[PDB]
Amino acid sequence: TNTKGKRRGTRYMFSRPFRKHGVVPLATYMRIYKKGDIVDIKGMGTVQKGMPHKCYHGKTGRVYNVTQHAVGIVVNKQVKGKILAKRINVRIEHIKHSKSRDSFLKRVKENDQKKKEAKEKGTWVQLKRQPAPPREAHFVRTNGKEPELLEPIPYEFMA
Amino acid sequence: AKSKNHTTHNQSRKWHRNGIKKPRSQRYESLKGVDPKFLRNMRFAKKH
Amino acid sequence: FVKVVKNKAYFKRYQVKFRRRREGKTDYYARKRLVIQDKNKYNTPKYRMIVRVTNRDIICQIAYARIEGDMIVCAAYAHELPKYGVKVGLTNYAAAYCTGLLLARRLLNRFGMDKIYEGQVEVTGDEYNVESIDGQPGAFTCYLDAGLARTTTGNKVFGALKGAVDGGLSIPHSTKRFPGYDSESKEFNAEVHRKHIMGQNVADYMRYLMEEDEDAYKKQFSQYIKNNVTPDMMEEMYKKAHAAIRENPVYEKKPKREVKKKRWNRPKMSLAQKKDRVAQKKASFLRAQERAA
Amino acid sequence: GRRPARCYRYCKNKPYPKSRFCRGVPDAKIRIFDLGRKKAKVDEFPLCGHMVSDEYEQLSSEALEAARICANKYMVKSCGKDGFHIRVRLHPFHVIRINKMLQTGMRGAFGKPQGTVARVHIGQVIMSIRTKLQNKEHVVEALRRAKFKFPGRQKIHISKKWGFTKFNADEFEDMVAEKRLIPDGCGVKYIPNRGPLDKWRALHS
Amino acid sequence: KENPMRELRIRKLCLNICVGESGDRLTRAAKVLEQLTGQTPVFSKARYTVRSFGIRRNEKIAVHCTVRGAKAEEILEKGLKVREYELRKNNFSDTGNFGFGIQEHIDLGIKYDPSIGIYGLDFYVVLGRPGFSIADKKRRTGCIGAKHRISKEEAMRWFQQKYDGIILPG
RNA sequence: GAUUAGAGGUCUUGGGGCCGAAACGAUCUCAACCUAUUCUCAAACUUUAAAUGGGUAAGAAGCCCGGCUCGCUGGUGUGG
RNA sequence: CCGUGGAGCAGAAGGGCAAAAGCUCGCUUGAUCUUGAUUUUCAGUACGAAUACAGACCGUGAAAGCGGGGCCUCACGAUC
RNA sequence: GUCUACGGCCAUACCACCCUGAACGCGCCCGAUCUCGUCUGAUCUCGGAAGCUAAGCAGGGUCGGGCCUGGUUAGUACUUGGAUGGGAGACCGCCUGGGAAUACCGGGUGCUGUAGGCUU
Ligand SMILES: [Mg+2]
Ligand SMILES: [Mg+2]
Ligand SMILES: [Mg+2]
Ligand SMILES: [Mg+2]
Ligand SMILES: [Mg+2]
Ligand SMILES: [Mg+2]
Ligand SMILES: [Mg+2]
Ligand SMILES: [Mg+2]
Ligand SMILES: [Mg+2]
Ligand SMILES: [Mg+2]
Ligand SMILES: [Mg+2]
Ligand SMILES: [Mg+2]
Ligand SMILES: [Mg+2]
Ligand SMILES: [Mg+2]
């Protein structure tokens, strides 16, 4: 059977990208994580302290505790037929703010603003994101040039 | 007397016929596992 | 022969270091431990004091890091000393002390905290640390950024640190790198540190030159003679400089003069130019070779 | 001495090359991969003919050598001793294994190395012949009689390229005259308009 | 014309003696070297272990020292006087430095002491130029450009012009 | 990490010879070497790199205000 | 002089590392005392191993800091 | 137009050679009494200001290498789902969707934050 080591099969997952080894850029250290941010997990092999287990690599969780160097986050893990929301502590290098939430936040601010506006105007405005509707009817103008014929080319071997 | 060693052939069906329920998310989550000194502060603030 | 080391594969696989590391200006290993604030302090600034001794100047700044680039809140330059009285000798230990004190006083004066935390008005050169006064705003705290300088005993970065500490800033330190610490006895000589601060170590050098040689003395201190500074008066002029700094530490920017918009360096030539150049180079070579043949 | 070739015709296992893990591999029988007047320039052997595989399979190294020997024999018989240049374009890198029986049975049934084969894809060249223009039917017949030494199905194709190059013969001469490719050994060097002007001066001088 | 201070100056002179075995011979070689150079030299341990030369790992087998300035040109003058200001084309390196060896030491102005014995040594000189400290200073290190470096021909010209020596072919 | 083939350079060395007392002085060469090319490969190689797929979000437990508590952090009723 | 690591980091291999995690010196014993939480196999039980803290005593450094064993992945043991 | 101190992103910024740098600045540079450290004041530390853009550094150049970004390769390779499709097989064609990577050919060659100067 296999081995139950903590880092089995991570030679590519925890490795560094090509031509990106060396000193960790300081912007990663200079970011602020508060209680309740949605955050992504991406193990970085450069630092070995507080490295998350390989099964949380690429997972997104919620911050619930902030500490000197690390952050505690609640993340869902599918174990057999059930999902457990378990909390793990990850050092700040292996973490990154999720941009999936800021889009929704900006949308909230923007449609709240356009709801506050036009409230006095009384006009109607659409807020829900409708799915891509079918294309409407239109005209395709030929400019006096007729469409050119397309025919299959004859078979002839290359190799 | 050999025998089959390991399989997961029916496991997905077994899990799904009752459904993989997400954890019961709900407001006011517990405060266990939080930094002790920050917790001590929050207790003092609530007290006063 | 021999392999070519700087091979195309070598350049393909080569990974450059950071720009500051390539220029040699920044020690990122030290910067990581120096400018990084604890995560549970959130956006609480972590101030630090940058001291850089140049070939002709002393730079002292107060900075805290930000993602787009660390921001300078206060700065003080050694070449401002002639305004307060120090006309010459802008690099020595005394000048470092005055510029550190000026930076400290400028920060507090910008910052509305002069009447509190006056610090050592009378220079003693001994172990001094400021304590926060209850019912009043807390003392400013920062940490020294020695940079790439070798932190041996008697370094001018530590001189600037002492100057600001006497100014009133609360900077953790120990009296081990100040001039005066004696390794063997492991003791500190506050009087020796004081005379180094006030510049006597140059006064005895000039008197030593007086003892034997004159032309060598002129060669060593030419601008000193031009500015008419004598060994005895250096202590008095440094005291006057300290008094003036503590009196008026505010900085006024020099008025801006309108530019005449003159380009001093060659602009980048365009694709059309650099293509016409090679075209006419080929034409010229062909026309020269057809005759030379 | 060796097992029939039908026992190793299909690409059933992953490529299993000889390396620090697979040790003790016997040497492949084919050692020479080209012969004839290989020390010839590019402008005297314009005609090029390939034998192209039509099946995805694996060809034994020895069968490679046997086909090479047959083609070389017919060529020296027909177009003289040095009027051609052969090139086998398949190197046997995938070693095969054998679990010999002498009674353990199927226990511990991982085979020892036996021989080497080359895995061939659909439409991949097997052998290439370059020669003068007039020996076209000679090339075709040599490749046709070499076909009988291989399993599966193969085709003969007279390439439109010039010799063993990647340039079409109907403007190869024009391009070399214009000095866009410079002949060397048995091939050519492409000269793009990208180097320093010193090389351009050197080859236009 | 010329730049007044792109001129050639010697920046260090290295003396060494490799005896190949530790002991009384080694310390007496150190003594003669320090008497010659006016300063204490240092011992270099063997990098590896080879029994052909009868040496092992980490024992002192050579004594070397370096000098700059006044004493450097005095010692170099003594050495060239011993070598009658005669050098060969191959004595000069591609980087502009050069050097030679003296088979025995008492000729260049050292009194013969029978106890210490006799020792030869190697002289090497590293030709410099104002600004070469950029390559090795700490704060902002950098190269020394292409024009500013020294070549074999410049070293030859400097040697033959400043010390009016002769470069015999070889 | 395997791997075929020819090109151009030199003394950087070796091998057959040759004129040479000898001479990188010289003649061919075979080589190893270097520089551009060229044929064919990798489950325990890789600059690149899919399709299928694995998380997270798509609001009332949300946003926007005003004010209190804190023994924590604090240049600063600062930050949290 | 060139030298992006082609070396070394105890050991297998893989990952990681250049004013360092490598080499050489200086000083030391955070390999120390103590309650909890969490991860890894998992039944989501132990052992083992590991991760963030917190409370004392310290070490080191000018200091920021770093350190409660070994750069990480293994080197170990219930009841009576 | 540009520099210095501290930086962010870390080659569009690197590497090789060549040309030009007004002012400030950064440097090279001159010495070792004191502080400090070496075999050596070479490095480090300290005290200065005779000379110089030679070098570093900055700007520019190269039908430059590299790097970055496009086109081609290519709807090719591969691939989700489907068939009582073909074929002795090996494999291949079609339907429904997604869709690469070399060679080869183009373009570009650092942006920018805070504080402080010079261009009076
Ligand atoms: Mg059975
Ligand atoms: Mg069973
Ligand atoms: Mg340091
Ligand atoms: Mg049979
Ligand atoms: Mg199989
Ligand atoms: Mg270190
Ligand atoms: Mg503790
Ligand atoms: Mg260690
Ligand atoms: Mg000096
Ligand atoms: Mg310059
Ligand atoms: Mg110049
Ligand atoms: Mg280019
Ligand atoms: Mg700027
Ligand atoms: Mg004017």
PDB file of C-alpha atoms in Angstrom, chain A residues 4-156:
ATOM      1  CA  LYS A   4       1.227   7.825   5.268  1.00  0.00           C
ATOM      2  CA  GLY A   5       3.901  10.524   5.220  1.00  0.00           C
ATOM      3  CA  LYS A   6       2.789  14.087   5.610  1.00  0.00           C
ATOM      4  CA  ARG A   7       4.421  15.297   2.402  1.00  0.00           C
ATOM      5  CA  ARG A   8       3.952  12.296   0.113  1.00  0.00           C
ATOM      6  CA  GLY A   9       3.392  13.204  -3.526  1.00  0.00           C
ATOM      7  CA  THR A  10       4.070  16.931  -3.123  1.00  0.00           C
ATOM      8  CA  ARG A  11       7.226  17.257  -5.242  1.00  0.00           C
ATOM      9  CA  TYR A  12       5.325  19.430  -7.722  1.00  0.00           C
ATOM     10  CA  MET A  13       2.654  20.876  -5.439  1.00  0.00           C
ATOM     11  CA  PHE A  14       5.026  22.388  -2.871  1.00  0.00           C
ATOM     12  CA  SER A  15       7.785  23.264  -5.341  1.00  0.00           C
ATOM     13  CA  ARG A  16       8.564  26.774  -6.462  1.00  0.00           C
ATOM     14  CA  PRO A  17       7.670  28.067  -9.935  1.00  0.00           C
ATOM     15  CA  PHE A  18      10.325  28.264 -12.618  1.00  0.00           C
ATOM     16  CA  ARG A  19      12.733  31.183 -12.133  1.00  0.00           C
ATOM     17  CA  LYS A  20      10.899  32.250  -8.977  1.00  0.00           C
ATOM     18  CA  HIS A  21      13.059  30.778  -6.204  1.00  0.00           C
ATOM     19  CA  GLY A  22      14.749  32.823  -3.522  1.00  0.00           C
ATOM     20  CA  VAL A  23      13.634  35.566  -1.160  1.00  0.00           C
ATOM     21  CA  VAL A  24       9.899  35.766  -0.528  1.00  0.00           C
ATOM     22  CA  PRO A  25       8.596  39.178  -1.653  1.00  0.00           C
ATOM     23  CA  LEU A  26       7.638  41.254   1.367  1.00  0.00           C
ATOM     24  CA  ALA A  27       4.190  42.261   0.093  1.00  0.00           C
ATOM     25  CA  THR A  28       2.937  38.857   1.242  1.00  0.00           C
ATOM     26  CA  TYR A  29       4.095  39.662   4.772  1.00  0.00           C
ATOM     27  CA  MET A  30       2.678  43.193   4.575  1.00  0.00           C
ATOM     28  CA  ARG A  31      -0.996  42.272   4.056  1.00  0.00           C
ATOM     29  CA  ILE A  32      -3.712  42.601   6.694  1.00  0.00           C
ATOM     30  CA  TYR A  33      -6.066  39.720   7.485  1.00  0.00           C
ATOM     31  CA  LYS A  34      -8.961  40.431   9.842  1.00  0.00           C
ATOM     32  CA  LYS A  35     -11.614  38.187  11.341  1.00  0.00           C
ATOM     33  CA  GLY A  36     -13.915  36.787   8.679  1.00  0.00           C
ATOM     34  CA  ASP A  37     -12.070  37.293   5.391  1.00  0.00           C
ATOM     35  CA  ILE A  38     -12.382  34.646   2.700  1.00  0.00           C
ATOM     36  CA  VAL A  39      -8.860  33.475   1.943  1.00  0.00           C
ATOM     37  CA  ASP A  40      -7.082  30.988  -0.318  1.00  0.00           C
ATOM     38  CA  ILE A  41      -4.544  28.324   0.651  1.00  0.00           C
ATOM     39  CA  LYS A  42      -1.441  27.708  -1.458  1.00  0.00           C
ATOM     40  CA  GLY A  43       1.453  25.922   0.217  1.00  0.00           C
ATOM     41  CA  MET A  44       4.849  27.489  -0.472  1.00  0.00           C
ATOM     42  CA  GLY A  45       7.858  25.250   0.022  1.00  0.00           C
ATOM     43  CA  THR A  46      10.315  28.082   0.632  1.00  0.00           C
ATOM     44  CA  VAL A  47       9.262  28.308   4.293  1.00  0.00           C
ATOM     45  CA  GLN A  48       8.588  25.085   6.187  1.00  0.00           C
ATOM     46  CA  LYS A  49       7.119  26.583   9.361  1.00  0.00           C
ATOM     47  CA  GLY A  50       3.336  26.425   9.532  1.00  0.00           C
ATOM     48  CA  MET A  51       2.982  24.636   6.217  1.00  0.00           C
ATOM     49  CA  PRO A  52      -0.588  23.416   5.608  1.00  0.00           C
ATOM     50  CA  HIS A  53      -1.225  19.773   4.879  1.00  0.00           C
ATOM     51  CA  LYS A  54      -1.402  18.881   1.205  1.00  0.00           C
ATOM     52  CA  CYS A  55      -5.146  18.200   1.283  1.00  0.00           C
ATOM     53  CA  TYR A  56      -5.935  21.886   1.893  1.00  0.00           C
ATOM     54  CA  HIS A  57      -3.797  23.105  -1.006  1.00  0.00           C
ATOM     55  CA  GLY A  58      -6.013  25.064  -3.358  1.00  0.00           C
ATOM     56  CA  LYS A  59      -8.875  25.316  -0.860  1.00  0.00           C
ATOM     57  CA  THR A  60     -10.675  28.461   0.261  1.00  0.00           C
ATOM     58  CA  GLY A  61     -11.618  29.116   3.869  1.00  0.00           C
ATOM     59  CA  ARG A  62     -12.702  31.801   6.330  1.00  0.00           C
ATOM     60  CA  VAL A  63     -10.401  33.477   8.842  1.00  0.00           C
ATOM     61  CA  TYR A  64     -11.511  33.087  12.454  1.00  0.00           C
ATOM     62  CA  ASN A  65      -8.356  33.885  14.449  1.00  0.00           C
ATOM     63  CA  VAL A  66      -5.381  36.179  13.848  1.00  0.00           C
ATOM     64  CA  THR A  67      -2.065  35.619  15.609  1.00  0.00           C
ATOM     65  CA  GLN A  68       1.482  37.065  15.576  1.00  0.00           C
ATOM     66  CA  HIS A  69       2.709  35.173  12.507  1.00  0.00           C
ATOM     67  CA  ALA A  70      -0.103  32.799  11.521  1.00  0.00           C
ATOM     68  CA  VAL A  71      -3.837  32.761  10.906  1.00  0.00           C
ATOM     69  CA  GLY A  72      -6.469  30.236  11.931  1.00  0.00           C
ATOM     70  CA  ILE A  73      -8.978  29.483   9.186  1.00  0.00           C
ATOM     71  CA  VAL A  74     -12.101  27.321   8.954  1.00  0.00           C
ATOM     72  CA  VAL A  75     -12.168  25.233   5.775  1.00  0.00           C
ATOM     73  CA  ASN A  76     -14.388  22.389   4.583  1.00  0.00           C
ATOM     74  CA  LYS A  77     -12.886  18.955   3.932  1.00  0.00           C
ATOM     75  CA  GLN A  78     -14.810  16.102   2.310  1.00  0.00           C
ATOM     76  CA  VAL A  79     -14.209  12.951   4.362  1.00  0.00           C
ATOM     77  CA  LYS A  80     -15.943   9.942   2.815  1.00  0.00           C
ATOM     78  CA  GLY A  81     -19.655  10.739   2.732  1.00  0.00           C
ATOM     79  CA  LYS A  82     -19.551  13.792   5.001  1.00  0.00           C
ATOM     80  CA  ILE A  83     -17.974  17.253   4.986  1.00  0.00           C
ATOM     81  CA  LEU A  84     -16.241  18.602   8.095  1.00  0.00           C
ATOM     82  CA  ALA A  85     -15.642  22.316   8.611  1.00  0.00           C
ATOM     83  CA  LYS A  86     -12.298  22.069  10.386  1.00  0.00           C
ATOM     84  CA  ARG A  87     -10.018  24.853  11.580  1.00  0.00           C
ATOM     85  CA  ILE A  88      -6.294  24.871  10.814  1.00  0.00           C
ATOM     86  CA  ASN A  89      -3.441  27.261  11.585  1.00  0.00           C
ATOM     87  CA  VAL A  90      -1.352  28.401   8.612  1.00  0.00           C
ATOM     88  CA  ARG A  91       1.619  30.736   8.625  1.00  0.00           C
ATOM     89  CA  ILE A  92       1.096  33.870   6.570  1.00  0.00           C
ATOM     90  CA  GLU A  93       3.325  32.826   3.651  1.00  0.00           C
ATOM     91  CA  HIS A  94       1.014  30.036   2.450  1.00  0.00           C
ATOM     92  CA  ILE A  95      -2.079  32.256   2.382  1.00  0.00           C
ATOM     93  CA  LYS A  96      -3.581  34.782  -0.014  1.00  0.00           C
ATOM     94  CA  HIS A  97      -6.704  36.935  -0.095  1.00  0.00           C
ATOM     95  CA  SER A  98      -9.459  35.491  -2.268  1.00  0.00           C
ATOM     96  CA  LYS A  99     -10.659  37.786  -5.042  1.00  0.00           C
ATOM     97  CA  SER A 100     -13.919  35.847  -5.425  1.00  0.00           C
ATOM     98  CA  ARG A 101     -15.506  37.885  -2.610  1.00  0.00           C
ATOM     99  CA  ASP A 102     -14.379  41.397  -3.556  1.00  0.00           C
ATOM    100  CA  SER A 103     -16.268  41.208  -6.853  1.00  0.00           C
ATOM    101  CA  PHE A 104     -19.493  40.482  -4.978  1.00  0.00           C
ATOM    102  CA  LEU A 105     -18.733  43.246  -2.475  1.00  0.00           C
ATOM    103  CA  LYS A 106     -18.172  45.774  -5.266  1.00  0.00           C
ATOM    104  CA  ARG A 107     -21.368  44.613  -6.960  1.00  0.00           C
ATOM    105  CA  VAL A 108     -23.236  45.106  -3.672  1.00  0.00           C
ATOM    106  CA  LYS A 109     -21.932  48.644  -3.279  1.00  0.00           C
ATOM    107  CA  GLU A 110     -22.702  49.497  -6.897  1.00  0.00           C
ATOM    108  CA  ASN A 111     -26.261  48.182  -7.066  1.00  0.00           C
ATOM    109  CA  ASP A 112     -27.004  49.663  -3.646  1.00  0.00           C
ATOM    110  CA  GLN A 113     -25.860  53.011  -5.046  1.00  0.00           C
ATOM    111  CA  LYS A 114     -28.033  52.660  -8.151  1.00  0.00           C
ATOM    112  CA  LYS A 115     -30.961  51.598  -5.961  1.00  0.00           C
ATOM    113  CA  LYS A 116     -30.560  54.673  -3.762  1.00  0.00           C
ATOM    114  CA  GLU A 117     -30.393  56.695  -6.966  1.00  0.00           C
ATOM    115  CA  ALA A 118     -33.512  56.604  -9.181  1.00  0.00           C
ATOM    116  CA  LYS A 119     -35.511  56.002  -6.003  1.00  0.00           C
ATOM    117  CA  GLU A 120     -36.643  59.622  -6.273  1.00  0.00           C
ATOM    118  CA  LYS A 121     -36.829  59.357 -10.071  1.00  0.00           C
ATOM    119  CA  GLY A 122     -39.295  56.465  -9.887  1.00  0.00           C
ATOM    120  CA  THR A 123     -37.846  54.677 -12.912  1.00  0.00           C
ATOM    121  CA  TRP A 124     -37.219  50.934 -13.053  1.00  0.00           C
ATOM    122  CA  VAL A 125     -33.729  49.420 -13.092  1.00  0.00           C
ATOM    123  CA  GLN A 126     -32.522  45.824 -13.303  1.00  0.00           C
ATOM    124  CA  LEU A 127     -30.229  44.497 -10.565  1.00  0.00           C
ATOM    125  CA  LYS A 128     -30.300  40.698 -10.825  1.00  0.00           C
ATOM    126  CA  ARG A 129     -27.684  39.323 -13.218  1.00  0.00           C
ATOM    127  CA  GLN A 130     -29.729  37.694 -15.933  1.00  0.00           C
ATOM    128  CA  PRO A 131     -28.097  34.849 -17.876  1.00  0.00           C
ATOM    129  CA  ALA A 132     -26.809  35.427 -21.391  1.00  0.00           C
ATOM    130  CA  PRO A 133     -30.000  35.923 -23.418  1.00  0.00           C
ATOM    131  CA  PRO A 134     -30.398  34.577 -26.957  1.00  0.00           C
ATOM    132  CA  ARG A 135     -29.139  36.887 -29.678  1.00  0.00           C
ATOM    133  CA  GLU A 136     -31.772  39.233 -31.075  1.00  0.00           C
ATOM    134  CA  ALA A 137     -32.605  39.724 -34.738  1.00  0.00           C
ATOM    135  CA  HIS A 138     -30.361  41.972 -36.809  1.00  0.00           C
ATOM    136  CA  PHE A 139     -29.224  42.671 -40.360  1.00  0.00           C
ATOM    137  CA  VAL A 140     -25.972  41.492 -41.929  1.00  0.00           C
ATOM    138  CA  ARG A 141     -25.021  43.921 -44.687  1.00  0.00           C
ATOM    139  CA  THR A 142     -23.029  42.700 -47.650  1.00  0.00           C
ATOM    140  CA  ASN A 143     -21.099  45.587 -49.200  1.00  0.00           C
ATOM    141  CA  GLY A 144     -21.507  44.453 -52.801  1.00  0.00           C
ATOM    142  CA  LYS A 145     -18.972  41.626 -52.470  1.00  0.00           C
ATOM    143  CA  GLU A 146     -20.496  38.177 -52.648  1.00  0.00           C
ATOM    144  CA  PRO A 147     -19.388  35.566 -50.096  1.00  0.00           C
ATOM    145  CA  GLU A 148     -16.589  33.385 -51.424  1.00  0.00           C
ATOM    146  CA  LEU A 149     -16.895  29.648 -51.903  1.00  0.00           C
ATOM    147  CA  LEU A 150     -15.362  27.275 -49.386  1.00  0.00           C
ATOM    148  CA  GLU A 151     -14.463  23.774 -50.520  1.00  0.00           C
ATOM    149  CA  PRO A 152     -12.541  20.952 -48.848  1.00  0.00           C
ATOM    150  CA  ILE A 153      -8.946  20.600 -50.020  1.00  0.00           C
ATOM    151  CA  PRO A 154      -7.783  17.372 -51.709  1.00  0.00           C
ATOM    152  CA  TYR A 155      -6.009  14.762 -49.655  1.00  0.00           C
ATOM    153  CA  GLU A 156      -2.266  14.624 -50.179  1.00  0.00           C
TER     154      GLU A 156
END
